[PDB]
Structures are given as structure tokens and as C-alpha cells.
Swiss-Prot record, chain A:
It is found in: Nucleus. The chain holds residues 63 to 124 of 1172 of the full protein. Belongs to the RNA polymerase beta chain family. DNA-dependent RNA polymerase catalyzes the transcription of DNA into RNA using the four ribonucleoside triphosphates as substrates. Second largest component of RNA polymerases IV and V which mediate short-interfering RNAs (siRNA) accumulation and subsequent RNA-directed DNA methylation-dependent (RdDM) transcriptional gene silencing (TGS) of endogenous repeated sequences, including transposable elements. Proposed to contribute to the polymerase catalytic activity and forms the polymerase active center together with the largest subunit. Component of the RNA polymerase IV and V complexes. Interacts with SSH1, NRPD1 and NRPE1. Mostly expressed in seedlings, flowers and roots, present ubiquitously, except in sperm cells. Disruption phenotype: Blocked in the perpetuation of CNN, CG and CNG methylation in repeated endogenous DNA. Reduction of heterochromatin association and methylation into chromocenters, coincident with decondensation and losses in cytosine methylation at pericentromeric major repeats such as 5S gene clusters and AtSN1 retroelements during interphase, independently of siRNA accumulation. Altered cell-to-cell movement of siRNA beyond the vasculature. Reduced 35S promoter homology-dependent transcriptional gene silencing (TGS) in transgenic plants. This is DNA-directed RNA polymerases IV and V subunit 2.
Curated annotation (Swiss-Prot), chain B:
DNA-dependent RNA polymerase catalyzes the transcription of DNA into RNA using the four ribonucleoside triphosphates as substrates. Component of RNA polymerase II which synthesizes mRNA precursors and many functional non-coding RNAs. Pol II is the central component of the basal RNA polymerase II transcription machinery. It is composed of mobile elements that move relative to each other. The keyword Hydrolase does not apply. It comes from the Eukaryota. Component of the RNA polymerase II, IV and V complexes. Associates with the mediator complex. Interacts with NRPD1. GO terms for cellular component: RNA polymerase II, core complex; RNA polymerase IV complex. The chain holds residues 9 to 50 of 51 of the full protein. Keywords: DNA-directed RNA polymerase, Metal-binding, Nucleus, Transcription, Zinc. Zn(2+) binds at residues 4, 7, 21, 24. This is DNA-directed RNA polymerases II, IV and V subunit 12. It is found in: Nucleus.
Length: 52, 42
């Protein structure tokens, strides 16, 4: 789903008015949920999110 | 005295900022039940 969404959107050239800037998007990757604690990374569970 | 979650350790923390379990990382604590007499009518 997300790959088709990002592939359908086409970013054209950006010109304020020679130099020009163009952007592109590659493969979309999604990682598993992880709690960013102050000490170290911890496993994230639905009940942890419900209680916090 | 507070009991942690997946980790078994007595917190016993009463400070306002102390909310994180020691040497555990998780911030979920359960209040422990002390030895108090309670009367119920059957
Ligand atoms: Zn703990």
C-alpha cells in the first residue's frame, strides 16, 4: 500500500523564480514499534501503550 | 513500596520525579498491598 502511494506522487523541479533542486523517494521501509527510553531501547507492547 | 511490571523488583520510591523502575527501564509500577485487617459481611 505505502509503496504505491509514494510511487504515485511525483515531485517536480523546485525553482524560486542556473541552480535547481529536485527530490526523489526510494524504497519505503517500516520498522517495528520500539519504545525510546532514556536508558536503552525496550520492547513495545499494546498494553504498555495503553497504560502509558 | 511499589511493584514493577514484567520485572520483579520493589521500587519503594516516593519522589515526584522517580517514576522509572531501577535497572528495568519500564515506567509502570503497581502499588503493593500491605498487611491490613479488613472486615466483610457475608
Ligand atoms: Zn522493573
Amino acid at each position: 500500500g505505502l509503496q504505491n502511494v509514494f510511487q504515485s506522487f511525483g515531485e517536480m523541479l523546485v525553482e524560486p523564480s542556473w541552480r535547481y533542486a529536485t527530490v526523489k523517494f526510494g524504497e519505503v521501509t517500516v520498522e517495528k514499534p520500539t519504545f525510546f527510553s532514556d536508558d536503552k531501547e525496550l520492547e513495545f507492547l499494546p498494553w504498555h501503550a495503553r497504560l502509558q | 513500596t511499589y511493584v514493577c511490571g514484567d520485572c520483579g523488583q520493589e521500587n519503594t520510591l516516593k519522589s515526584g520525579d522517580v517514576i522509572q523502575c531501577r535497572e528495568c527501564g519500564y515506567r509502570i509500577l503497581y502499588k503493593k498491598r500491605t498487611r491490613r485487617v479488613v472486615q466483610y459481611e457475608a
